[PDB]
Each structure stands twice: as structure tokens, then as C-alpha cells.
Symmetry: C3
Subunit: 179 residues, 3 copies
């Protein structure tokens, strides 16, 4: 059972990137970071420059700020393992541009199940707080939850990362109750 | 391993409804949605109309915006499975109306332990964010946490749903340490 | 295997404290609550008065608002189980003072791995909401995230408490996928 797709979900500073990187690097495959993120403020400019300087020379980086599905179709193959650094930031680029988010979330789950070579998606959980007091935050919260539902379904494996520790929730049989 | 009561907890758009609906249809009993809110804005009006179109003729609807406990005691019988749509919206009704929340929370947990028929409670986790900046939201966060704890103790089974996927957390031996 | 150090993580009003207290009281060593919390409002005062009336006189209090690593090295002995009230409030005290958080967190991880006696850290998850409106809250989200990771590494056991129910996530075999 070599898997062809893994979804890693966790909160903010959960350890999910470090965990993703560790699976990618123990694969003995040719590694490509698919990057959805553009540092456009100082806070964000830190994280990219600083934590990139602690990736091996072994990694290759391709940017995909909008056309994530298209990039995966083209760049995926059996010698390569692709890592999508943030589904979260990709969805945010689309939301802020005014795209309707259903078709591309739907395209991404399709692409993930029909992929040439293996891929790891890293995504945030944003759904476990108080309902946001603005239409934008609320609309993102729905797209993020739906998207993580459609990836988790399409992907062979799914792991949840809490406090730097990983827990497989797929593969694995879901509970079924007897009333 | 037979049960009377299930709590399904998850975040917003976690797939907890889908999951409660699947366990409900799996039982073959007669099926009642206990709706705990009508929709008073456009966004809510829509979420409650896709839900309506995705339930076939096996499903009946009884409203209980406030007297959820009483309604569960009248309607719960062995031919029936009741699904409480959102505990979260119920607590929201009580909180805004100015009710003290401890007595009705305790009465729901007591009611859950003693029902004539089976029931699935669907509820949100709301306590994994940054401390909210207003007394109303902090009070909701305290009350939804107590309510999820008292239902979870009362209920036979508890499932946690992430990214459309359920994990049982009750029954199951809890950790112990030397 | 008898353990040195337990991390207890979960959301607001999840049963973290009650769970921590149950394990502490089942251990039959001497019980010290390492309080980190100044009730400087009505809500906060009621929270810690409902806690203190639910504890047999078997419990002794000790305040550590700022110097929590130091306080743990000085009070820990196998004759004693120590329970820190809230890692979260300790972090908050430091953030508000203007301290740089990295050193004091790494110091605390170090100390937890090398204790004279058993300790339980009780800590909040705050990473699963929408990004905060303001830098103060963002800075806190990243620090509480980093702190839970390092304390999970350093502690022998990690539990995750949802709706009053503890799941053990460490020790246990981290899932490994192969592609
Ligand atoms: C119940 C509810 C609350 C609950 C919280 C529930 C929660 N999950 O945290 C409580 C009572 C806390 C609440 C408080 C408030 N909320 Co309110 N309420 C809602 C409502 C109706 C449902 C949200 C929810 O329960 N989850 C939805 C669940 C059931 O779906 P799910 O996928 O299964 O999860 C929403 C949404 C809406 N109608 O659009 C607003 C809504 C988000 N609330 C709103 C308001 C006005 C507030 C308050 C500011 C109230 C006030 N005037 O003081 C506070 C803000 C709290 C904050 N964000 O800091 C507005 C937001 C307006 C805007 N976009 O500018 C909304 C959209 C409703 C409206 N009036 O139209 N609310
Ligand atoms: C520590 C703390 C913080 C921490 C975060 C804690 C967390 N959980 O995220 C930090 C420093 C980040 C913080 C930030 C702020 N908070 Co503050 N602080 C608190 C305090 C005292 C403890 C909350 C806590 O950590 N509880 C979680 C644990 C301990 O509880 P448990 O899970 O049940 O266990 C709270 C609550 C309170 N009642 O005072 C306020 C409190 C919520 N904070 C407050 C304020 C004003 C803020 C800030 C707006 C300050 C600022 N000027 O930027 C920000 C923004 C918060 C936001 N939601 O954006 C006020 C809110 C006032 C109001 N309701 O009108 C409170 C009520 C303090 C007070 N007495 O005034 N806060
Ligand atoms: C993507 C994003 C959003 C997303 C949501 C992302 C999320 N919930 O995770 C959306 C589009 C919803 C959003 C909305 C807003 N956010 Co925004 N955006 C960001 C950004 C760039 C990403 C951080 C992140 O999502 N995850 C990081 C992931 C990859 O890693 P990890 O989570 O640690 O793991 C941030 C942060 C930043 N410093 O740039 C701001 C940022 C936090 N957002 C900002 C703003 C202003 C907003 C909005 C007010 C936009 C608006 N004008 O309505 C709302 C408010 C949201 C709220 N209610 O709290 C500002 C906040 C400024 C401040 N004073 O602190 C930031 C700092 C950007 C900026 N420099 O101007 N945002
Ligand atoms: C959430 C808010 O953050 C800003 N924004 C959007 N994308 C980025 C980015 N990659 N880096 C920094 N700021 C960003 C915009 O101003 C948006 O409204
Ligand atoms: C959080 C805020 O949402 C509004 N409110 C309360 N209940 C509902 C509902 N079912 N649908 C829409 N809006 C609602 C009120 O204005 C409340 O103060
Ligand atoms: C988030 C805000 O909470 C206040 N604050 C800090 N510590 C406490 C406490 N123990 N109790 C109540 N309020 C507190 C400060 O004013 C800070 O700005």
C-alpha cells in the first residue's frame, strides 16, 4: 500500500508543516514544494526567508498562487512527490479575488484522486472558534471546511496534527452505531 | 453493542450533519429532525433549504427552539430516532433571551440519560480559538463547553468529526497514569 | 511504564482541569497546584473560586505568574506531583510584559525533560479559529502553538481532552506513510 495522496490538517503553529516535510523527505523521491503564498507583509516575509533557509538543497520550489489544480496536473509524476504548503492561502487568494470557490475546490478533489504521482496537501482547521462577526471570515470558514471535507474524501490517507504529534484518521474504518 | 444516545461534536462545516444523518438512516427507525432554530437572515435561510432537499420522505420535522428537553421527553419512543439539529442554536436561543443556562443544560443531560427512545445530539466545538473580546461570546464559549461535557458524560457514545471523518471517543477506556 | 511528566491540552471549558485533578488525586503523592493566574476581573475570580471549593484540603497552592521554570526546579521532588494551573496564562503574562517568548518556552521544555519529581502541565489549544484581527492575538497564537509542541516533545505522556473526555496521543506510534 504505497499511498498517492495524503492530507495533513491542523491548527495554527500545530507542527503540520514539519510533519509533512518529514514524510516527504523519508520517501527517497524527488521533492517539489508547490507554493501558494506570497509574503506581502513583514510578519509573513519573516516566515518564508527564515524557515526556507532550513530546507535542504534537495527541494525544488514552484509557485501556484491561483492555478493550483493545473500546476498539479503538469508537475505530478512517479519520480516526484509534490507538497502544497497551504491550501489555506490558495483559498484566501481566490476568496479575496472574488472567484466563486465551489468549482475550483471541486476541481482540486478531482485532480487529487486522478494524480500521476504522489502529493501531500497541508491545510488549516479554522472551524472550532466563535462564529466570526464579518461576512468575509464566515465565507472563508465554510470554504475551508468544505474543501477539507472534499480533500479528505479524495485522498488515500488523512492525518490530524495536534501539538506537533500526528494522528491518522484515514485509512481507518469510521464508527457505525446501533440504536 | 447497543446504545440510546449519541453526541456528534465538530467545527463549522466539519461534516457532523452528514454523519448524524448516516447513523440515523442506518438504524431503519422512523426519523425526526428536532429543528432548534428557524432562519432569520439570508445565509441561514439557504443552509436550512439545501438540508431540506437532502432528506427523503423517511424524515419528519418538529421545532423546539426553547423547550428542547420537554420536546425530547414527549417525542422520544422506541419506533423513533430523533436528531437534535444544533444544540449550539438552542443554547444561542436561551443565551440571547436572557435565560440562566445551567438549569436547562443539567435538565438536557438528565433527559439524555433517561429517554424512552434513541437520540443523536449534533453540537459545535467553539472553544479552540482566541479568547473572544466581548462578554456575550465568552459566556457562549463557557456554556457550550459545559453543555458538551454534560451531554458527553450522559450519552452512551461520543464521536468527534474532522474534515468529514468521525472518530469514536466514547465508549472506550480513558487514559490512566502512574 | 510509570511517567515523569504529562501535558493536558484542550479548548476553553473542555474538562482539562477536572481530568488533570483526577489523575493527580489517584497518584497519592503530595499535591501542589502551581497557580499562574491573577483574578483581575469578576469572571476570572468566579472561575478560580469554583475551582478552589472543588479541592479537598489535600491541595497546597503556589503562585508562579512569571518565573515558572525556576519555580518548577525549586518545588519538584518525587514526594510531590506538581500541576501548573495554565501554561496559557503564564505565556499571556510574559507577552503582556513585553518579554521575548522563545527563551522562556525553550527553558520550560528543557526543565520538563529533567525534573526531580512528577509534573502535569494544563494548556489551551487556540490555533483552530480564524486569524486574529490584531498583532497581539496573532503573536499569542504562534507562541501558544510553539509552546504546546515543545512541551509535547519534552513530556512522556500527552492527552487531548474533548467534551470532558481524555484521549492519550503520546506515547503511541506516530503514523508513517510510504509513497
Ligand atoms: C448563533 C449565532 C451566534 C452565537 C455564536 C455561535 C457560535 N457558533 O459561535 C452567539 C450568540 C455567540 C452570537 C454572537 C454574536 N453574533 Co451571532 N449569529 C449566530 C448565527 C445565527 C449562527 C452561527 C452558528 O451557530 N453556527 C452556524 C452552525 C449551526 O452551522 P454549522 O456549519 O453546523 O456550524 C450566525 C450565522 C448567520 N446567521 O449567518 C450569527 C451572526 C454571525 N451573528 C451576528 C452577530 C451580530 C453577532 C454578535 C456581534 C451579536 C451582537 N450584536 O453583540 C456576536 C458576535 C460575537 C463575536 N463574533 O465576537 C451576525 C453577524 C453580522 C455581520 N456579519 O456583520 C450574524 C451573521 C447574524 C445576523 N445578525 O445577521 N452569534
Ligand atoms: C489571557 C488573556 C488574553 C490573551 C489570550 C488568551 C487566550 N485564551 O487566547 C491575550 C493577551 C492574547 C489577550 C488578548 C486580548 N484580550 Co485578553 N484577557 C485574557 C484573559 C484574562 C484570560 C483568557 C484565557 O486565556 N482564558 C482561557 C483559559 C484560561 O480558560 P479555560 O479554557 O476556561 O481554562 C481574558 C478572559 C477574562 N475573563 O479576562 C482576557 C480578556 C478577554 N481580554 C481582554 C482584552 C481587552 C483583550 C484585547 C482586546 C487586548 C488588546 N487591547 O488588544 C486582546 C484581543 C483579544 C481578541 N479576541 O482579539 C478583555 C476583554 C474585555 C471585554 N470583554 O470588553 C478581557 C475580558 C480582560 C478584561 N478583564 O478586560 N487576552
Ligand atoms: C489569509 C488571511 C486572511 C483569511 C483567513 C485566514 C485564516 N483564517 O487562517 C481571510 C481572507 C478570511 C482574512 C480575512 C481578514 N484578515 Co487577513 N490575512 C490573512 C493572512 C495573509 C494569512 C494567515 C493564515 O491564514 N495562515 C497562515 C498559515 C499558512 O500558516 P499557519 O496558520 O501558522 O500554519 C494573514 C496573516 C499575515 N500576518 O499576513 C492576514 C491578516 C491577518 N489579515 C488582515 C486583515 C486586515 C483581515 C481582515 C480584517 C480583512 C478585511 N479587511 O476584512 C479580515 C478579518 C478576519 C477576522 N475577522 O479576524 C491583516 C490584519 C491587520 C492587523 N491590524 O492585524 C493581516 C495581518 C494582513 C495585513 N497585513 O494587512 N485574512
Ligand atoms: C487578509 C488580508 O491580508 C492581506 N493579504 C492577503 N494576502 C496576503 C499575503 N499573502 N500576505 C500578506 N497580506 C496578505 C490583504 O489585505 C487581505 O485583505
Ligand atoms: C448573533 C445575532 O444573530 C441574530 N440571530 C439570532 N438567531 C438568529 C437566527 N436563527 N438566524 C439569524 N440571525 C439570528 C441576532 O441578531 C443575534 O444577536
Ligand atoms: C487581555 C487583557 O486582559 C487583562 N488581563 C491580564 N491579566 C488578567 C487577569 N489575570 N485577569 C483579568 N484580566 C487580565 C489585561 O488588560 C490585558 O490587556
Amino acid at each position: 500500500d504505497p499511498i498517492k495522496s495524503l492530507l495533513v490538517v491542523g491548527g495554527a503553529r500545530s507542527g503540520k508543516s514539519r510533519f509533512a516535510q518529514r514524510m516527504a523527505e523519508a520517501s527517497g523521491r524527488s521533492l517539489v514544494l508547490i507554493a501558494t503564498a506570497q509574503p506581502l507583509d513583514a510578519e509573513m516575509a519573516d516566515r518564508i526567508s527564515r524557515h526556507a533557509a532550513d530546507r535542504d538543497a534537495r527541494w525544488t520550489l514552484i509557485e501556484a498562487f491561483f492555478d493550483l489544480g493545473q500546476t498539479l496536473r503538469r508537475e505530478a509524476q512517479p519520480e516526484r512527490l509534490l507538497v502544497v504548503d497551504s491550501v489555506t492561502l490558495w483559498l484566501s487568494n481566490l476568496l479575496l479575488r472574488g472567484d466563486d470557490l465551489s468549482p475550483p475546490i471541486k476541481d482540486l478533489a478531482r485532480t487529487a484522486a486522478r494524480l500521476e504521482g504522489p502529493v501531500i496537501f497541508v491545510s488549516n482547521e479554522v472551524g472550532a472558534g466563535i462564529v466570526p462577526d464579518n461576512a468575509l471570515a464566515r465565507a472563508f470558514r465554510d470554504a475551508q471546511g468544505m474543501c477539507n471535507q472534499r480533500l479528505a474524501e479524495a485522498c488515500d490517507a488523512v492525518t490530524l496534527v495536534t501539538a506537533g504529534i500526528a494522528t491518522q484518521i484515514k485509512p481507518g474504518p469510521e464508527p457505525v452505531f446501533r440504536f
